[PDB]
């Protein structure tokens, strides 16, 4: 299982080894040995979520406060989504930068988003199903959103032929990256790096 | 999340609460609190597998030796499969009995199969995708198969319009339930119950 670190350190694109046969195909989405190899520790799966999205739906950008924050291991099992990770860790060398992975049912990649990072996606097709393993259960009291179209982050979302994204009400009213930063709610690089080190 | 114990004790059918909105739908597939409620302990996810199957493919019947065996939390995210669990635990009150759950992308149910049970499924539609969380990594040296069409177990598979199942080569040559039993490879109820108790 090929794992490539993204331009945001602590986020990875994983490409599975897909076994194809007369019955269809099989692959190992996660393995503890494969995960540990790139992440340096085991993924503690406390929750697994699934969404189905129509074309142009944008969910994000979410993060969870440290600790324990909420690491995400994210894949698309039908359709396709353009998935984004944002370095929101203050003091990080790449603070403010983002990168993307194309998740879909063709190459069946995954994005791993480690703790204190922000994540979201835009569904590129109808009936786009995303599953994601989380290192913590849903905790609306420590989960935050950043406007997915925030001009400081300036993520380049690939609009669908060629229309405005559909967002939830909460995601549509999300505060700006600068609002969140100035609220002292962004994770700190020093502590996220240390928290990941104590797991390793 | 509604959890109903099957006729095989230690296997459960889980029905999620599906949240539907303008974007599509979302649900929590697993939560630690929801899992613990019915299973009495946390699921230790060490591997997650995914298959895509065409109509009439039958995978099974697999089990893993205790300990730690391999508990499975199994769902269908596209298409539909008829999923079977078999009580292969010697000394169990329901030794030899089986039950089924219909997994599909409509009701989005799950089957939880605890340790020392045997599991399999028959895909009822093309492009039937199954994901499953496992409490242990793939260990071909402690994993065994029982003929899915074994006459002692006598599972009633729902053949697809109306043809023989397609099996892997290994599953097509699997030994009989009585071969496995007589090889002392079946799990023991007393130890599986005790192993689950030490986790609880």
Curated annotation (Swiss-Prot), chains A, B:
Subunit (UniProt): Homodimer.
Catalytic center residues: 62 (proton acceptor), 132 (proton donor)
Organism, scientific name: Mycobacterium tuberculosis (strain CDC 1551 / Oshkosh)
Record keywords, A-Z: Carbohydrate metabolism, Isomerase
E.C. number: 5.1.3.13
Residues under site feature: Participates in a stacking interaction with the thymidine ring of dTDP-4-oxo-6-deoxyglucose: 138
Phylogenetic classification of the source organism: Bacteria, Bacillati, Actinomycetota, Actinomycetes, Mycobacteriales
Name of the protein this chain belongs to: dTDP-4-dehydrorhamnose 3,5-epimerase
Entry-linked Pfam families: dTDP_sugar_isom (PF00908)
Protein's job: Catalyzes the epimerization of the C3' and C5'positions of dTDP-6-deoxy-D-xylo-4-hexulose, forming dTDP-6-deoxy-L-lyxo-4-hexulose. Involved in the biosynthesis of the dTDP-L-rhamnose which is a component of the critical linker, D-N-acetylglucosamine-L-rhamnose disaccharide, which connects the galactan region of arabinogalactan to peptidoglycan via a phosphodiester linkage.
Gene: rmlC
């Amino acid at each position: 299982m090929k794992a490539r670190e993204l331009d945001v350190p602590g986020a990875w694109e994983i490409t599975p080894t897909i076994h194809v046969d007369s019955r269809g195909l099989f692959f190992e989405w996660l393995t503890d040995h494969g995960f540990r190899a790139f992440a340096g520790h085991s993924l503690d799966v406390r929750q697994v979520n699934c969404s189905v999205s129509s074309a142009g739906v944008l969910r994000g950008l979410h993060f969870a406060q440290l600790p324990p924050s909420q690491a995400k291991y994210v894949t698309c099992v039908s359709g396709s989504v353009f998935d984004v990770v944002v370095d929101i860790r203050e003091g990080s060398p790449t603070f403010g930068r983002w990168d993307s992975v194309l998740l879909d049912d063709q190459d069946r990649r995954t994005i791993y988003v480690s703790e204190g990072l922000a994540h979201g996606f835009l569904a590129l097709q109808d009936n786009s199903t995303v599953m994601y393993l989380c290192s913590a259960e849903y905790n609306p009291q420590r989960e935050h959103t950043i406007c997915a179209t925030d001009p400081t982050l300036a993520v380049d979302w690939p609009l669908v032929d060629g229309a405005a994204p559909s967002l939830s009400d909460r995601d549509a009213a999300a505060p700006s990256f600068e609002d969140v930063r100035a609220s002292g709610l962004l994770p700190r690089w020093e502590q996220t790096q240390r928290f990941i080190g104590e797991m390793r």
